[PDB]
């Protein structure tokens, strides 16, 4: 089989979440059921019998497939849109490479210090959002060694009064760097300058936008309806899927397996249904199918810095082609 | 478990909404069933048994389930637009901080103004469809002690002869102050003149979204259905799962719990599932996960009058960075 | 409860659509059991309840839900849809009265006629469109009292050969008007022209949107399939649901409520889901919930003829704000 | 009944397409039933009685509901999709209009041959969607003869070297006849003819998506799925719905109607909710309720020669309205 | 009927994906019986019996249809994005061929290298995402050999040190060679070199979306959910479906058909229904309902290079059309 092959898999994987919950779900079925075998007494194994039949009436399995089924896809589709909202200066680069013009250090000066900051930005973001970047960068001491900030760009960053998160100052820095270029003619087109404030807030935008997937997050009202809905069918389970003796002839009940093989295979699939929205309501961490930001973020920072430095004004000289 | 520790939250959880529908739910089932123990007459005792096995035959969970998703999925949906047509002014403030020119006071004039003209029409709109911003300004006169609005921009705002919704009003005077800066030669460039039409109209479409989905909610016929559905339901689980006597011997009616535990289970999932579209149908008032209206106000205020002031024009001189 | 107070509602309500399909029902129902009470021979009465244990095996509420969900999303997104595409004229207006110039009577002849055309092309979609708006407006004289269409635009308009909607017209009509303002230098910038050709495109799209959904509806073989989907169900109720006499000891109809209280509230449940379909299946009627264009056809024309004339250069004087 | 009278519809109704489908079932199953009427002998009709309740127990109308209702979701949004990627000229016309310029016939020339090449792409990409537009042009001769083409650019069209669908063809010419009309000055602004480039890509974007939605339809894999699915269920009730005679005494088999009434309209709903899909997976042939293409042609030529020729600088004079 | 004729084609159709699965299936099905038959004694067939009226009481196929049609209602929509993403350069080619200009081997230099540039770099995408067009160019020497590379243009494209993926470089290169067009006035117009640049980030952007999709893929948990959620189904009908002896007198076990005939229509739906998402998971292979790339990127090759160098300024003169 095609998807055969996948659940060999640990990486990631459904096992990987969900082997401490089933040992729990399990281990609670055999203390519960060696109990009816040694220590409950015989009047009351008979007023267990009923409490068994009475459970795996309320015991059902569509509903919960409603509340899962709505819930996994509003979450899947709010963590693919975090992802196109993630900050990349691939646009903005090719608008500084044409737009941006000079040979000498203060082209050059005009073409890194645009692209590095629109990457602070994108490191102030992803610090905010995102766990992994978080510990990569503590403090802003961090982003200062790591050669986003300067010193002299720290000095006035944090003489700014605001108590808001300030990743939107190296976007307001940007355009005013970008207006002196303008004014000094670096900039050779005014509507190459329009072209650059455009590309600039379609950055700034999905910077905001992180923000406001990480501010407003799926309602906690109807996780938590969810997770009791899940877990009110496992409790419906852990007695009214208990092997009763076939010796008190209750129908339905002629087995004595000790193991809810059927009952563990739907555990796998519901509370592994309910882990896939467990994963993807937070993308940003250390786990091993989270958003890989760290990588991402050297990236952006090496294919800008390569591209508006040593790429510029260097072409081949135009041959013909083998289609001439 | 994962979302298992979020149950035992209090701040705008499930319990926060239900609680009180419950102790309504278990009281009038304890007040029905003790009528079964005390008062009621042994001959319409066992017409009250006929009637607990006619209504648990027609309280099918199924249906109900369909009628909540597919009635969620949409007001969730509509809850999650209407956070995107928030009037925020940072996209704004990058343009106004390129475009409009001057280290004196006339520029400061114009930055500020043309900044506070947004921040004035995204106040107009807020205390429309917000009654957490309508409680902060219940008059025009507490906009002009905010600072939002001048005493001789009142005069003029106030003489305008209109039956509708002013809150257009600050956006056309952007226009007119933009078109001013431009004739003056405060915007150097035709096509950046051109950039600051074109965010504006992108900023008063935000305010005019805002107003639409105020004024077009959700039908109430539709609001009408998916409640009755629910209730329907309690009532045929507040008669069909009430505990008759063992020794009439009807068939799955053999124990006396005096607790529907599994149908306030029920009770919590679905009443619960209708519990978050009530909260997600009115998203701007004072409830504790609605949304923060009173503190974004004063960011995109204070946010957008550091840019344009403090922040324009005033760069760290060109280092040459750490990669360079 | 939250949603509980707006079952008490009439205007626009689920009783007001579905109290005369009740008595049908109803009234149908009883007329079926005083047969069986009384006129049906006795050899045919066990006819009778053979036929009622047929049809309530048959009568399935799970399928029924399935073809209203779906249908009804499809319809309540196409609905929202048709909301987003009505001819507004708020972006129009900002960009006439920062773009045309002018304080002569001739600046205000362009500002005035600039922003008519535009509302004229919206009468002319929606009473194309609207019933509502078609009884306001049934002849296009009725356009030319009401100030929308002058008498000698109405000649050229009528004398235009074309068998198809004339909406386009005035849309033309404004694109000869601008390049006659950019021609006489009424408009400084080439790029201020751009501005006004890309929305009044974005203006005319949304009335040609406005055509497409009135022209292309959901398809009729869908309406019809849910349609008889909800009445075939409704049929297997009406005999399946009936209370058979409890002498006979057929099993689960043991009682003689003579009255389907149940049944009523399954009724009130998929007949008024099938309600919403109807009601949003053509938005723009006299019914108390579509969308109220009469008012907006006065708004748009009130409020961008108050924005182009008395707002034109008109600001106050530029005073430091309580925060400089 | 609002919807209640669409059911007495012939025109493109679930009748016209499914009253053949009907009596092919119902006809089987007389012809089944006829079988254990006569000819079947009394053992062999025990073994009949069997089968019968073996295929009941098999035949779940639920699952068949979601293979459905998720089959049909898919394709009626691909459906509504290719109707808004139909080659409409009338936001080219406003721009042609407004940025061409000349009262000579060589501006006449210009508009007019503009107009004319998006109206040649667009009978070029709906000949190759389009059954209905392909037997009014079955050759390149027959869009000559209607005066889309001429037969001077019928020679280097069919000299171009290209294995592909030539219908980028005319909008290249485009780019090609507005370049030389910006070039002789025919366009006044540069921003201008920046304008009528951007809005033929627009156009050409629509005329390549019709051809990626005819390339790339539903999945053949999933249209046969949820079709076995379909018929699965339909010989699960040619067989399990037979009326077994009460003399044998099986459960739930006690009448002999000889017509499957709730079968019959079991496969009113399960066949016509497949039927949906069928008539909206190539919505471009010549069935009543397919997209009416041959008049929508006439009308993209109509009415853009009348805009860009009568309606060329062709204004009333300005007068004071009604309101001034 | 309509979707009837389709079941019986093999080319990329359900039965050329599942017919391995069915015979692994059902000769495991007979494996299973012939023992019941004659290896298994007499005690343990006993045993076996109460083993299959087990696991045919949780063998639901409810659920399992809920986690198919929201698992495969992502998938297809996550798969017709993807085709909406691919490198196409029809928006371009009319862009170059309308802005770039000259009739001498210069401009046929610039005209030829720029769409050559954005088809490099759609190759050096689709040879990073898809296995089709990898195995045409396994190395870079083969896209040299193919003629979207020069040697001159691989020197410095192997020279970059980058450690990440270079598709981006043409797309670089395209930006530097149109700002030396508009150097060397090629370029008449700034705002057409502005329009180059907008349409090239348009076209980088989709070769940017190409490899977001294939990095991040449908998560690996909620595949194997869904897969665990199909193959516990057909291990609850490998046993509880098997033909038990009529002489024991089981209910609902009456017959030995020794085929599970409506068991194996259903593994056609299910395990159907999961095929769809396996072949729409990875669009880019082999298969033969995968994404035609290499027909594709011969077109936007031949295709591009046709319009921007013989059909560049080369019209047809304006003739009058038939409806003048
Ligand atoms: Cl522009």
Redesign the interface.
Known sequence: ????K??L?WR???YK?LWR?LLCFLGLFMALSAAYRFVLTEEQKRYFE??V???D??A????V??????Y???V?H?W?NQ??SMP?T??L???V???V?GHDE?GR??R??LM?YAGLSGVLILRSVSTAVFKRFPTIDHVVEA?FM?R??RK?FEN?????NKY??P??????????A??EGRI????????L?????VF??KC?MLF?YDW?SV???????????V??YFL?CLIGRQFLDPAQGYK?H??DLCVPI?TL??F??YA?????????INPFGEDD?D?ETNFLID?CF??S???VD???????????????
């Open positions: 089989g095609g998807f055969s996948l659940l898999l990631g994987s459904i979440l919950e009923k409490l039949l009475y459970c009436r309320y059902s399995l569509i509903p497939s409603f509340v899962l089924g709505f996994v896809t509003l899947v709010r693919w992802y196109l990349l691939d646009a680069m090719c608008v490479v044409g737009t013009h203060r000066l005009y890194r210090t590095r050669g300067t002299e760009e006035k700014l009064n605001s108590s808001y939107w100052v976007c307001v820095w940007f355009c005013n760097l970008a207006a002196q303008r004014r050779r087109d005014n509507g190459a300058f329009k072209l404030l455009e590309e600039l807030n700034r935008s905001g406001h407003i309602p906690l009202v109807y996780t938590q309806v969810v997770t009791i809905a877990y009110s419906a339905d002629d087995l059927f295979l739907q796998f699939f592994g249904w309910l882990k896939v929205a467990e994963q993807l199918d958003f990236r090496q294919v810095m390569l591209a040593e790429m510029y004004d260097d072409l081949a000289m135009l041959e013909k082609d083998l289609y001439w």
